[PDB]
Amino acid sequence: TTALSLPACPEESPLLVGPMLIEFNMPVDLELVAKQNPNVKMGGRYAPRDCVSPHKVAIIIPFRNRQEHLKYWLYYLHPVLQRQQLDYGIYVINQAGDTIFNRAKLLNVGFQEALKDYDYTCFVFSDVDLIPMNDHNAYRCFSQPRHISVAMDKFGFSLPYVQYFGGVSALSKQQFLTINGFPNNYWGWGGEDDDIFNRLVFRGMSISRPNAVVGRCRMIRHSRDKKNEPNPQRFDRIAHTKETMLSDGLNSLTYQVLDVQRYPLYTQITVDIGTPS
Numbered sequence: 001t002t003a004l005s006l007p008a009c010p011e012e013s014p015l016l017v018g019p020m021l022i023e024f025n026m027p028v029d030l031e032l033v034a035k036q037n038p039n040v041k042m043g044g045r046y047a048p049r050d051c052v053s054p055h056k057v058a059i060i061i062p063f064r065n066r067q068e069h070l071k072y073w074l075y076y077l078h079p080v081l082q083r084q085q086l087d088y089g090i091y092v093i094n095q096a097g098d099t100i101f102n103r104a105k106l107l108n109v110g111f112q113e114a115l116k117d118y119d120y121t122c123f124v125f126s127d128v129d130l131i132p133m134n135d136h137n138a139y140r141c142f143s144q145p146r147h148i149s150v151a152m153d154k155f156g157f158s159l160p161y162v163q164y165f166g167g168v169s170a171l172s173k174q175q176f177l178t179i180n181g182f183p184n185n186y187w188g189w190g191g192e193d194d195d196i197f198n199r200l201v202f203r204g205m206s207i208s209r210p211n212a213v214v215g216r217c218r219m220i221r222h223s224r225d226k227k228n229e230p231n232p233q234r235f236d237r238i239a240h241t242k243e244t245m246l247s248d249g250l251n252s253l254t255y256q257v258l259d260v261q262r263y264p265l266y267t268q269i270t271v272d273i274g275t276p277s
Contacts, residue, residue: 006050006051006052007051007052008051008052008053008054009048009050009051009053009054009055009085010051010085013084015082016084016135016136017083018134018136019133019134020076020132020133020134020135022076023223024221024222025223028068028072028074030071030074033078033265034264037078037079037082039082040082040264040265042262042264043090043262043266043267044074044089044090044264044265044267045089046078046086046087046089047086047088048085051085052087053085055085055086055122055140055141056087057081057087057088057120057122057124057139057140057141057170058088058089058111058114058115058117058118058122059077059088059089059090059091059123059124059126059139060091060093060107060114060124061073061090061091061092061093061126061127062093062095062103062106062125062127062128063093063094063095063268064095064101066128066129069129069220070092070128072220073129073220074090076132077090077131077132078265080135083135084135084138084140086140089114089117090265091113091266091269092128092266093106093107093109093110093113093269094269094270095271095273096258096271097272099275100187100188102187102276103186103192104183104184104186104192105182105183105253105255106271106273107125108181108184108249108250109253109255110123110125110269111123111176111181111250112250112253113257121172121173122170122171122172123141123170123171123173123176124140124148124169125168125169125171126148127149127166127167128220129219129221130152130168130217130219130220131217131218132148132149132168132215132216132217133216133217134213134214134215134216136210136214137216137217138210139168139170140170141172142170142172143208144206144207144208145169145170145175145200145207145208146170146208146209147164147168147169147207148167148169148210148215149166149168149169149215149217150209150212151212151213151215152216152217152219153216153218153219153226154221154228154229155228155229155231156231157216158231160232160234161231161233163194163197163207164193164197164234165193165194165196165197165200165207166193167217168217175205177250178203179199179202179203179245180199180245180249180250181249181250181253182199182249183195183196183245183248183249184248184252184253184254184273185248187276188276191235191236191237194235194237194241195245198238198242199241202242202245254273254274256271257269257271258270258271258272
């Protein structure tokens with residue numbers, strides 16, 4: 001007798017539906033979400049049964065005190081990620097304590113901690129408040145670093161500037177290692193997303209983007225609060241990034257994991273990342 005390994009999944013998934021209506025006028029029951037997503041296994045982990053996805057994706061959400069927003073995120077994204085036939089896991093990196101938020105350091109934590117679970121080769125870094133409006137917008141990696149949230153409703157569906165890298169992005173393991181990860185030292189200063197962009201183009205990379213219709217995303221907010229925010233200006237950090245990118249990153253990532261929870265729909269890692277010192 002002879003066994004046959006599973007086929008790799010197709011380049012293009014045949015399960016996609018295209019555009020989706022994203023609304024926030026209804027409560028979310030995470031137990032129902034789990035029941036409606038029965039193939040999602042403990043810790044927010046899924047892989048296709050019929051095929052071997054090339055996309056081994058850790059989705060990393062930097063987090064503090066945003067549970068109700070996280071529920072909407074899980075409600076919308078789990079169905080999309082399954083339809084995209086991804087071998088994926090959800091990581092919510094929760095910053096313990098009440099010091100200034102350090103988004104990029106928590107992203108770096110997620111990279112390192114996710115790798116202790118599984119041989120992931122792609123990392124999606126996502127704001128908890130951003131939901132894609134079209135499941136052709138792939139939550140996985142490309143030959144170039146990928147900017148996923150290209151047309152956000154809160155910016156009028158405009159891209160703030162050509163170098164804008166905020167919201168949702170995807171880097172391969174290799175892209176991330178080549179840039180020495182993300183800066184840990186920004187804390188509340190501003191510009192970590194521009195720093196990351198600068199790292200990538202200093203390393204010869206060129207940002208890839210879905211087209212602007214496919215790449216539309218909705219910000220979680222009450223309907224009464226819908227409005228166009230001002231587009232952000234670029235932070236001036238090019239020279240700074242060049243000076244510091246090799247000394248601030250994976251090789252300076254200091255943290256302690258305080259507790260880990262494998263909930264049905266996500267893994268939460270609560271961490272002490274120290275202080276702006």
